[PDB]
Amino acid sequence: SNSFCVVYKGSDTDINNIQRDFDGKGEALSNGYLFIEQNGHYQKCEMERGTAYLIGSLYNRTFLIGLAGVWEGEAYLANDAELLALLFTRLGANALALAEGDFCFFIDEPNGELTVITESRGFSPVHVVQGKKAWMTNSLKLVTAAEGEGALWFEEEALVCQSLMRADTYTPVKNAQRLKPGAVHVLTHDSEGYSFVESRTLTTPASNQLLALPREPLLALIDRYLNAPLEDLAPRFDTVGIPLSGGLDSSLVTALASRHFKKLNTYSIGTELSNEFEFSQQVADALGTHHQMKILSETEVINGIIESIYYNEIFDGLSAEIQSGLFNVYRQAQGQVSCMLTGYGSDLLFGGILKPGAQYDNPNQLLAEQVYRTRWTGEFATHGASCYGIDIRHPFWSHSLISLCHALHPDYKIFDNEVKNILREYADSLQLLPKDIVWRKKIGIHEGSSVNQAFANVLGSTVDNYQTKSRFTYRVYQAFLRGRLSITDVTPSQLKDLIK
Amino acid sequence: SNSFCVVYKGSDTDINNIQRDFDGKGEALSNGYLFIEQNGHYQKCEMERGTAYLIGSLYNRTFLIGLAGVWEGEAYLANDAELLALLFTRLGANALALAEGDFCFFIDEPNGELTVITESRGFSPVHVVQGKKAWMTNSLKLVTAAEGEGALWFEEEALVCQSLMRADTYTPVKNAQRLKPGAVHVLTHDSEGYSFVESRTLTTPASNQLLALPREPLLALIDRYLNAPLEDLAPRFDTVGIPLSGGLDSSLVTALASRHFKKLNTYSIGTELSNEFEFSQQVADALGTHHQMKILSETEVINGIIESIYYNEIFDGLSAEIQSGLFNVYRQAQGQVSCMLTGYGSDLLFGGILKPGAQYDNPNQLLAEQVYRTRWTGEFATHGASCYGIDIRHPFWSHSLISLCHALHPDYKIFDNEVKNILREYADSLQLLPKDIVWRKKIGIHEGSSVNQAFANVLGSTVDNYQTKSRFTYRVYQAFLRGRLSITDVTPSQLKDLIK
Amino acid sequence: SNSFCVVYKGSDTDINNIQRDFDGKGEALSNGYLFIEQNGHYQKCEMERGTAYLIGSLYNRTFLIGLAGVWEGEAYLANDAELLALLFTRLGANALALAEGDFCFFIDEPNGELTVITESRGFSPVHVVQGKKAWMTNSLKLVTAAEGEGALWFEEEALVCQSLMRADTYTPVKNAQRLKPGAVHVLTHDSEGYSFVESRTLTTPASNQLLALPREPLLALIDRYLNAPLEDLAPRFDTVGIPLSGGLDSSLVTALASRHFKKLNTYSIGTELSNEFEFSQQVADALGTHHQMKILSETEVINGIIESIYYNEIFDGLSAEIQSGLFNVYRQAQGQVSCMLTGYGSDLLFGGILKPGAQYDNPNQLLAEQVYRTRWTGEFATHGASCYGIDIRHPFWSHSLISLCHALHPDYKIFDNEVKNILREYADSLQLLPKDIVWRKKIGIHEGSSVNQAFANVLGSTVDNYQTKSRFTYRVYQAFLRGRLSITDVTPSQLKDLIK
Amino acid sequence: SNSFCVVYKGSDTDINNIQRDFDGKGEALSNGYLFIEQNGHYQKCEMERGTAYLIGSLYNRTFLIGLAGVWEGEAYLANDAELLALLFTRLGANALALAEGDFCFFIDEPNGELTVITESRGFSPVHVVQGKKAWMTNSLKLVTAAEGEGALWFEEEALVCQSLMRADTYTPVKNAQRLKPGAVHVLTHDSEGYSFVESRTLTTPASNQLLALPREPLLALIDRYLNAPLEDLAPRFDTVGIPLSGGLDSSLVTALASRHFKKLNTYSIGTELSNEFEFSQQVADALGTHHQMKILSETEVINGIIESIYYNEIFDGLSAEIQSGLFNVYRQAQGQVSCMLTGYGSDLLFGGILKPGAQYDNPNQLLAEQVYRTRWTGEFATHGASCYGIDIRHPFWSHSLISLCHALHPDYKIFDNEVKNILREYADSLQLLPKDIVWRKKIGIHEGSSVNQAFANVLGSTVDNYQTKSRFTYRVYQAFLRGRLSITDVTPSQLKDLIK
Ligand SMILES: Nc1ncnc2c1ncn2[C@@H]1O[C@H](COP(=O)(O)CP(=O)(O)OP(=O)(O)O)[C@@H](O)[C@H]1O
Ligand SMILES: O=C(O)C[C@@H]1CC[C@@H](C(=O)O)N1
Ligand SMILES: [Mg+2]
Ligand SMILES: [Mg+2]
Ligand SMILES: [Mg+2]
Ligand SMILES: [Mg+2]
């Protein structure tokens, strides 16, 4: 309940099929139809070139408004679509890469042509699928629901789940195309009516020359970009949820959140094999939040994996494994909060994944690759949290912080047998978090809870083997997208066949 | 002996593998290498944006020169690349769609990214293959020769040999994309080095509203556009070859050729099952040409098929079958001529594939689909003829004629129990061809020679079943491209395994 | 009698005021009015971005249709406006610089903001005047007729008649702007309603490197480009008028015209003792044409000068002097022919204005300089010949011929004690003109009839002083544009009052 | 800040002639020279298309850096040139309209073509003069100092000292064009070397619909934007000078300035007739600033007028008269402060120029026209204060604040019996100024000090006839621009010697 899709030359027919298995509302376009799920947000506005549609949400309206406001006072009362329409017409499509959010902006032009701009981080992945008709969706399952069990053609698993590094346009669906995040696309049709996408990147590669930014300004920038999101979310939502791990990043977000929201709800998960409760409880107490822990069973851990696969359409094993915890937290917080903040991604920007004390020829490059990889996995899809009535946000994943850190001088990421140095300095400068927390060694979600082990135990493979895990995930991935498995009646106990 | 390829960030190494199975030379680019087959033509030009390359040949230089000459005198002595560069900078990339020929234009810029423009008819089909490295080639086999037998991933034949109509960007190779003919493509790379193709069509769909062009002006245009091709080649050749069938179109081309060249070599093929030799001899006598006839055995018919597959990289059954006769003609003319003209495609423009006296709701739409289908088959590829030292030209296939005929009022294509009415009237005003030829009912190459029946006999199927024929063609296609079969040691007798 | 003007937010009074002195009609536009004289031509076309207007005529429709025909069959029946719209939407504004004619193309966008494109040779000069309201016209007299005598401000004759070489955007009207020929202009208004012309040139300076184009190809191009303008005129007009001087160029046009038209009416003029009749008659008989010479009187010579100034809005001394002869020829045939051809401008392309035997370091530069001068003078305006029911045409002044000669090798224009060497070899090969004509040394219109002497006499100056003669021409130019004088009522009184 | 100029194909003579009257340096360019005064500021950056130059100063670097930082971390250390280059190549030329300052950005293309972008407020006016050579400067007196007294051709005082409504591109100099502020200008040269300015506005008119922005949001916006300019000057400049009149605005600034800087030096002026020292003093106490009043004699006042005309090249009577007070304040602060803040322009944004209690059909339209009027006057010129070693700043004149007030709902600018209502309400909340001050009343510079009276007394005319006052200003203006008068050598006789 959050996704959308559009079909060219489509009618109510093709939509009714979708609506059968998914609830949402249809809407006609000049030459097609637009389907948007129940909990889906959207806005529209008239432009000289046609009607503009903005599907999804914006995370930095404040910044965008401030920008448009330089030349148009009507920027302060503009709805999302009108806001982006102002930037589009004044600064060209490239300006839309400045926007953050799980959005998709497109213009329904009279000539039947669709001009679409995809968000640039992976919050709202969009595919153009060639079925009986051409479909553009941010949820591949919608297409199957409309044209049938065979609509989607999947690639061989031997080819799919083997490598770990892919382009941000990679997709295992042969009869489909993954639109590049942060680019402009025009959906045209040639003389014989065949679909042809014309895409253009909205952002060129940033320099890789070390950024020797002085200490004081750096700290000011970090404080500013981490609080910017929270200040945006401050107005609405009096209460905010936070998956607490007691880790540095998740804890730092809670600290900052304490100064922006009235009430805070912290959640923790772990298995019978291990948990981080001791550290999270320490932060919850220090901040006096409505804390509550939970020890997930094996069945729960697996259910979390397959839920992220279904909802965020993840086919990568590591990603699905990492999401499991988060998905159980959403389930634990359902009905308690409507907004959640995380510390997800910080380790990829400040050097958390680097081994303390180890030597690295080019640590920044190592990190950049990971930042990039999150573009196609589905880790950042928001559909999952949405179906639990949650608007999941990741404060660290902002354009400004990512760009700042992209080539930030390594000495701030790894120095003196430490990691995330500058982030630690900033964290305790807040005088809100306990020293053991601020200086805790990094420990991942799937690691600290031993979810990686629980998963390996059910697949009967070594915790290290992520290719065997991907085989499984890709396997259920196709099963869910082919409609051969309904999220409603599915249990890990009935997936033994997909194991061997 | 005419194809080419480019590899992003490739050394002489990646080329050595190719120059091992094929002949040609490799030149280095800013961030890559360019391989050009032994008998392949190409020119270079220095632009401000970088070094421009023109690989292949131009068919309408005279027209392009006359255009560029409107504002720049140097157009009269510009090489092929410099000529297109003038159009490029003066009228934009769209101006290159005005060019005809088996060419590929591209600019190598310092930034590393190349801007390429593909010819717009299918004379030089270009693919972008994602192997160990990104490859752009107008010959897929070259990539196999470069990285191995597993470089190209082929789709399931059940999915490929089904539908008859395909988009002009269709390709059975999963890890490759067929570049749209008549479009501009910029080959860029993102922050992580991954390849991304930004395409934009150079031409939009023409109008489908009936073109009620008065009789006389129409006849003048037909006289003009059919001769222009011959007036371009006249100064470059004294002798010309012509696959003659005694049909209306190839005979009309011969009549014209006799007025532009010194000697004419007409060739005719057939099987022991049937032939059109009778009609062919009439035209040869009337125009007094150096005529030659040849009966083909089943082995030669099949050999002509698998050759068109290998050289023009054709996987379609009907196309491979049709090319058989032509490929046998090339062998017969080898060493006798260096250029050939045909009447190929005329039936797709003037109503020839229409049934005399039959009623049609939308004849032009029917013809248009056929015209379009030629874009992806490889039937217009030139490599085959080229390897036989022949520059193959199809006079009817010019931009002006195709566009003129696109929506030409149907009463000129089918009327009074006749077809190709306007064309027959035109060929008549020439007073050079016998009436029985000018008004002969149309009969295809694969039909009049019963090649269709012979092909059916070996596959043990029915003449009409081009689905089974495609299975065979796609089958050898895959074998040839994977390098599993060699054109030097392949005979129809050793391919019985692909039939079962 | 074929001019037009456009006024932004004009009222019906503006139009009525104009109609008080000039017959015609006003057509309301989006946010203003468009006026066109009784005998002015104009076509319209509906575009996506608004209504396209094409006022004037096109001289090379055949060539333009051939260009558009490459992709749109409807190009064969498109009106001038539709034809230019096809080129505009397909190849950009730059494509419109490829058309020849005394035209003006503009698009009326609902927002009141029109986009205008001017022809690229000066055949139809266009100004943007800032009176009470903003005007756009190809006739300055219209603004006066509409807003009054004090509408146009003129610069001191001390600054106007001084320098001889000016930019093609030069205008002696301080409150007007001469739109650069061959450029796209966007007429906009800022937030406070002030006019702002955003212009952009559609051409780039051509190369000045010597063109070593061989003799055969060169003669073939001369034949093509010289005969092409006659081919486009053969259809209509059975009888054409030709001002014949007996000069090489005018005679070459008569010979060539004799093989394209049915009836040729040649007209020659001369003053007292100074005439070229002997040579004109030779050609008239050598080609058997309807010839008729007429001796001009003192008053008639001077009147031709004031008429060229009134109609063509010429303020340049030499220009008016030269135009004097042609204006007498138009009157000589004000009802016998509807179309005239001339050899005007030929000397600026082939070196006629060069001194035989003389040595030049850069003759082409000297010539190109003169070619450029004709852009602002008003020599190529069609108004005058129009008001006489004649369609004035100059075969030599085609984009192709001009561009060819631009840097053509000097040995073809001046060599071995001769000039226009290649042009003469061409005429000679026609075996249609007497030797004494093919090699007759260049003699200008104003020189051969001593008009340059007659004009000087009435002013009491020297034949060489054009700075003084320009002061006179500038005097009447101002007078006429202020309506203070009438082309029909030019009494001797006011004449002398203009001498000084 | 300090004047500069560029001369196409300039010679060393030109430069040395300039250094003869004005001290500075000249750096060679691709095809010309670039001069800059001793106190002139400029930075360069190597671009792909050429070398970029940023002459002047940026006032909103932090904001521009916050924009570029979204995609390029290198923006945090880029110089002014590099920073604009970052925005230019990523968001196009339109992006440079988002920057505020007395700057001029231009790119020296290797071919000689110069791409120039002008600031969008009139802070640094730029002209393109056509004298012996072609020039581009922000000081008309530089071209004279290099060409001679006859460089600049001025228009008759009849069409200058009259009209009150001028376009932002208006200039009294006939042979000089005023480059529209907020636009990109490309200085081309056609095939014959003649100059041609191809301009294009970088902004579009903002909507004129009433802005119904609620109270609280509006107040925050006023606060943020009024303080933003001060946060940019906080780091440097420990001390700041503020011309305090005692009015609502200047006082409010002094108030907000006290919460940012360390030491505030307030200055006030007036005449024998009267002054605002009373109110001015109250503010000096409430804030405890370093306030010194100074009465101006008959001279000094008339001197501040001729000073503004020389340095700011102001020719508008009213404009000069207003700047008269500011200049006298600079001299009173020279050596003591390096930066000054003013409440200048506030009345044009919040309605302070409107008559309290009066009814207006469209009060924002009147205000907008005034705002616009300041674009061609020279009021915001910084050259004047610069020479006094002072960086003059006007906090109210920001793109955001201006854009906000443009259509702000009138009830905020004039309700019941008040004006600047919302501004007054804002100042009140600050709790730093006395009631009688916060709710004072509109009182101009030339008014509060009877400066308009003194100026008038020297001309004999009344204090309302600004046509005679402009008559005087326009005369000295021309005198100075010809060097016929010196800034220092201003004989009290030469005043009258002006036929005045
Ligand atoms: N046990 C747990 N309870 C609640 N949320 C958890 C969790 N383990 C992981 N998460 C969620 O997943 C995200 C993942 O984080 P990690 O990369 O391990 C981050 P961490 O919390 O930042 O600590 P670290 O950097 O010290 O390892 C966190 O920001 C957190 O919101
Ligand atoms: O019209 C003008 O010249 C400007 C007005 C006069 C007062 C001045 C100000 O708002 O500080 N602007
Ligand atoms: Mg952790
Ligand atoms: Mg046939
Ligand atoms: Mg002559
Ligand atoms: Mg005041």
CSV table of N, CA, C and O in Angstrom, one decimal, chain B residues 63 67 69-74 76-77 90-91 94-95 98 202-204 206-207 209 211-213 221 225 399 403-404, chain C residues 63 67 69-74 76-77 90-91 94-95 98 202-204 206-207 209 211 213 221 225 399-400 403-404:
chain,number,residue,atom,x,y,z
B,63,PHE,N,23.6,14.4,-52.5
B,63,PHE,CA,22.5,15.2,-51.8
B,63,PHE,C,23.0,15.9,-50.6
B,63,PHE,O,22.7,17.0,-50.4
B,67,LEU,N,23.5,20.0,-49.7
B,67,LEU,CA,22.9,20.6,-48.5
B,67,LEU,C,23.9,21.4,-47.8
B,67,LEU,O,23.8,22.6,-47.6
B,69,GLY,N,26.6,22.4,-48.9
B,69,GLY,CA,27.1,23.5,-49.8
B,69,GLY,C,26.4,24.8,-49.7
B,69,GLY,O,26.9,25.8,-50.2
B,70,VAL,N,25.2,24.8,-49.2
B,70,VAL,CA,24.4,26.0,-49.0
B,70,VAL,C,25.1,27.0,-48.2
B,70,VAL,O,24.9,28.2,-48.4
B,71,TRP,N,25.9,26.6,-47.2
B,71,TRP,CA,26.5,27.5,-46.3
B,71,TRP,C,28.1,27.4,-46.2
B,71,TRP,O,28.7,28.2,-45.7
B,72,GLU,N,28.6,26.3,-46.7
B,72,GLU,CA,30.0,26.0,-46.7
B,72,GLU,C,30.6,25.4,-47.9
B,72,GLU,O,30.3,24.2,-48.2
B,73,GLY,N,31.5,26.1,-48.6
B,73,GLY,CA,32.1,25.6,-49.8
B,73,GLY,C,32.9,24.3,-49.7
B,73,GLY,O,33.0,23.5,-50.6
B,74,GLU,N,33.6,24.2,-48.5
B,74,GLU,CA,34.4,23.0,-48.3
B,74,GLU,C,33.6,21.7,-48.3
B,74,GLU,O,34.3,20.6,-48.3
B,76,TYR,N,32.3,20.4,-50.8
B,76,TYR,CA,32.6,19.8,-52.1
B,76,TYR,C,33.9,18.9,-52.1
B,76,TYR,O,34.1,18.1,-52.9
B,77,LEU,N,34.7,19.1,-51.0
B,77,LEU,CA,35.9,18.3,-51.0
B,77,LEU,C,36.1,17.6,-49.6
B,77,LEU,O,37.2,17.1,-49.3
B,90,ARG,N,26.1,22.3,-37.8
B,90,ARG,CA,25.2,23.3,-38.4
B,90,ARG,C,23.7,23.1,-38.2
B,90,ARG,O,22.9,24.0,-37.8
B,91,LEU,N,23.2,21.8,-38.4
B,91,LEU,CA,21.8,21.5,-38.2
B,91,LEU,C,21.5,20.5,-37.0
B,91,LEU,O,20.3,20.1,-36.9
B,94,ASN,N,20.0,15.6,-35.6
B,94,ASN,CA,18.8,15.2,-36.5
B,94,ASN,C,19.2,15.2,-37.9
B,94,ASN,O,18.6,14.4,-38.7
B,95,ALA,N,20.1,16.1,-38.3
B,95,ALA,CA,20.5,16.2,-39.7
B,95,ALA,C,21.1,15.0,-40.3
B,95,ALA,O,21.1,14.7,-41.5
B,98,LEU,N,19.3,12.4,-42.4
B,98,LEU,CA,19.2,12.7,-43.8
B,98,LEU,C,20.2,11.9,-44.6
B,98,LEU,O,20.1,11.8,-45.9
B,202,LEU,N,16.0,10.5,-33.8
B,202,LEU,CA,16.3,11.6,-34.6
B,202,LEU,C,15.1,12.0,-35.5
B,202,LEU,O,15.1,13.1,-36.1
B,203,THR,N,14.1,11.1,-35.6
B,203,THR,CA,13.0,11.3,-36.4
B,203,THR,C,11.7,10.9,-35.7
B,203,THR,O,11.7,9.8,-35.1
B,204,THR,N,10.6,11.7,-35.9
B,204,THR,CA,9.4,11.3,-35.3
B,204,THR,C,8.5,10.8,-36.4
B,204,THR,O,8.7,10.9,-37.6
B,206,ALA,N,5.9,10.0,-39.3
B,206,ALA,CA,5.3,10.8,-40.3
B,206,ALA,C,3.8,10.7,-40.2
B,206,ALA,O,3.3,9.9,-39.5
B,207,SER,N,3.1,11.6,-41.0
B,207,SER,CA,1.6,11.5,-41.0
B,207,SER,C,1.1,10.3,-41.8
B,207,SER,O,1.8,9.9,-42.7
B,209,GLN,N,-2.1,10.4,-43.0
B,209,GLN,CA,-3.2,11.0,-43.8
B,209,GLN,C,-2.9,10.7,-45.3
B,209,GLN,O,-1.8,11.1,-45.7
B,211,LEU,N,-2.0,10.8,-48.9
B,211,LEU,CA,-1.2,11.8,-49.7
B,211,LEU,C,-1.8,11.8,-51.1
B,211,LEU,O,-1.4,11.0,-52.0
B,212,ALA,N,-2.7,12.7,-51.4
B,212,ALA,CA,-3.3,12.8,-52.7
B,212,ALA,C,-2.4,13.7,-53.6
B,212,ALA,O,-2.8,14.8,-54.0
B,213,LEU,N,-1.3,13.2,-54.0
B,213,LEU,CA,-0.3,13.8,-54.9
B,213,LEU,C,-0.7,13.6,-56.3
B,213,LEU,O,-0.9,12.5,-56.8
B,221,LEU,N,8.9,12.6,-59.3
B,221,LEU,CA,9.6,12.3,-58.1
B,221,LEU,C,10.1,10.8,-58.2
B,221,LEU,O,11.2,10.5,-57.8
B,225,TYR,N,14.0,10.0,-57.6
B,225,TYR,CA,14.5,9.2,-56.6
B,225,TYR,C,15.1,7.8,-56.9
B,225,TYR,O,15.9,7.3,-56.2
B,399,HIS,N,15.4,7.2,-48.6
B,399,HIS,CA,14.5,7.9,-47.6
B,399,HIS,C,13.4,8.5,-48.3
B,399,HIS,O,12.2,8.4,-47.9
B,403,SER,N,9.4,7.5,-47.8
B,403,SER,CA,8.6,8.6,-47.2
B,403,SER,C,7.5,9.0,-48.2
B,403,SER,O,6.3,9.2,-47.8
B,404,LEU,N,7.8,9.0,-49.5
B,404,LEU,CA,6.8,9.4,-50.5
B,404,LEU,C,5.7,8.3,-50.5
B,404,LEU,O,4.5,8.6,-50.5
C,63,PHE,N,13.9,22.9,-53.5
C,63,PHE,CA,15.0,22.5,-52.6
C,63,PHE,C,14.5,22.2,-51.2
C,63,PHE,O,14.8,21.2,-50.6
C,67,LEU,N,14.1,18.6,-49.1
C,67,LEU,CA,14.7,18.4,-47.7
C,67,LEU,C,13.7,17.8,-46.8
C,67,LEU,O,14.0,16.7,-46.2
C,69,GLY,N,10.9,16.4,-47.7
C,69,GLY,CA,10.4,15.1,-48.3
C,69,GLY,C,11.2,13.9,-47.8
C,69,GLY,O,10.7,12.8,-47.9
C,70,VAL,N,12.4,14.2,-47.3
C,70,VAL,CA,13.2,13.1,-46.8
C,70,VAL,C,12.5,12.3,-45.6
C,70,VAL,O,12.7,11.1,-45.5
C,71,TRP,N,11.7,13.1,-44.9
C,71,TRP,CA,11.0,12.4,-43.8
C,71,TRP,C,9.5,12.6,-43.7
C,71,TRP,O,8.8,11.9,-43.1
C,72,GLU,N,8.9,13.7,-44.4
C,72,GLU,CA,7.5,13.9,-44.4
C,72,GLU,C,7.0,14.1,-45.8
C,72,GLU,O,7.3,15.0,-46.5
C,73,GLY,N,6.1,13.1,-46.2
C,73,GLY,CA,5.5,13.2,-47.6
C,73,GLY,C,4.6,14.4,-47.8
C,73,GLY,O,4.4,14.9,-48.9
C,74,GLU,N,4.0,14.9,-46.7
C,74,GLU,CA,3.1,16.0,-46.8
C,74,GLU,C,3.8,17.3,-47.2
C,74,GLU,O,3.2,18.3,-47.5
C,76,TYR,N,5.2,17.8,-49.9
C,76,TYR,CA,4.9,18.1,-51.3
C,76,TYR,C,3.7,19.0,-51.5
C,76,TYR,O,3.6,19.5,-52.6
C,77,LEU,N,2.8,19.1,-50.6
C,77,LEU,CA,1.6,20.0,-50.7
C,77,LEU,C,1.5,21.0,-49.6
C,77,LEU,O,0.4,21.6,-49.4
C,90,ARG,N,11.7,19.9,-37.2
C,90,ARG,CA,12.6,18.8,-37.4
C,90,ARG,C,14.1,19.0,-37.3
C,90,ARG,O,14.8,18.3,-36.7
C,91,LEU,N,14.5,20.1,-37.9
C,91,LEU,CA,16.0,20.5,-37.8
C,91,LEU,C,16.3,21.8,-37.1
C,91,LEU,O,17.4,22.3,-37.3
C,94,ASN,N,17.8,26.9,-37.2
C,94,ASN,CA,19.0,27.0,-38.1
C,94,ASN,C,18.6,26.6,-39.5
C,94,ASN,O,19.2,27.0,-40.5
C,95,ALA,N,17.6,25.6,-39.6
C,95,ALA,CA,17.2,25.1,-40.9
C,95,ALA,C,16.6,26.2,-41.8
C,95,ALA,O,16.6,26.2,-43.0
C,98,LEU,N,18.3,28.1,-44.6
C,98,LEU,CA,18.5,27.4,-45.8
C,98,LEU,C,17.5,27.8,-46.9
C,98,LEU,O,17.7,27.5,-48.1
C,202,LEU,N,21.7,32.4,-36.9
C,202,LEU,CA,21.4,31.0,-37.4
C,202,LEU,C,22.6,30.5,-38.3
C,202,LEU,O,22.5,29.3,-38.8
C,203,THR,N,23.6,31.3,-38.4
C,203,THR,CA,24.7,30.9,-39.3
C,203,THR,C,26.0,31.1,-38.5
C,203,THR,O,26.1,31.8,-37.5
C,204,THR,N,27.1,30.6,-39.1
C,204,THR,CA,28.4,30.8,-38.5
C,204,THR,C,29.3,31.1,-39.7
C,204,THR,O,29.1,30.7,-40.8
C,206,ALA,N,31.7,31.1,-42.6
C,206,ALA,CA,32.3,30.0,-43.4
C,206,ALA,C,33.8,30.2,-43.4
C,206,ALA,O,34.3,31.2,-43.2
C,207,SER,N,34.4,29.1,-43.8
C,207,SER,CA,35.9,29.0,-43.9
C,207,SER,C,36.4,30.0,-45.0
C,207,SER,O,35.6,30.2,-45.9
C,209,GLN,N,39.5,29.5,-46.3
C,209,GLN,CA,40.7,28.8,-46.9
C,209,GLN,C,40.4,28.7,-48.4
C,209,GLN,O,39.2,28.4,-48.8
C,211,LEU,N,39.7,27.5,-52.0
C,211,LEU,CA,39.0,26.3,-52.5
C,211,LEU,C,39.6,25.9,-53.8
C,211,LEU,O,39.4,26.6,-54.8
C,213,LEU,N,38.8,23.7,-55.9
C,213,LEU,CA,37.8,22.8,-56.6
C,213,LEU,C,38.2,22.7,-58.1
C,213,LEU,O,38.2,23.7,-58.8
C,221,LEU,N,28.8,22.7,-61.2
C,221,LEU,CA,28.1,23.4,-60.1
C,221,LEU,C,27.6,24.8,-60.6
C,221,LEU,O,26.5,25.2,-60.2
C,225,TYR,N,23.6,25.5,-60.3
C,225,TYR,CA,23.1,26.6,-59.5
C,225,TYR,C,22.6,27.8,-60.3
C,225,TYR,O,21.7,28.5,-59.8
C,399,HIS,N,22.1,31.1,-52.2
C,399,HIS,CA,23.0,30.6,-51.1
C,399,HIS,C,24.1,29.7,-51.6
C,399,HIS,O,25.3,29.8,-51.2
C,400,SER,N,23.8,28.8,-52.6
C,400,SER,CA,24.8,27.9,-53.1
C,400,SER,C,25.9,28.6,-53.9
C,400,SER,O,27.0,28.3,-53.8
C,403,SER,N,28.0,30.9,-51.6
C,403,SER,CA,28.9,30.1,-50.7
C,403,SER,C,30.0,29.4,-51.5
C,403,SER,O,31.1,29.2,-51.0
C,404,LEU,N,29.8,29.1,-52.8
C,404,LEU,CA,30.7,28.4,-53.6
C,404,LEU,C,31.9,29.4,-53.9
C,404,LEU,O,33.1,29.1,-53.8
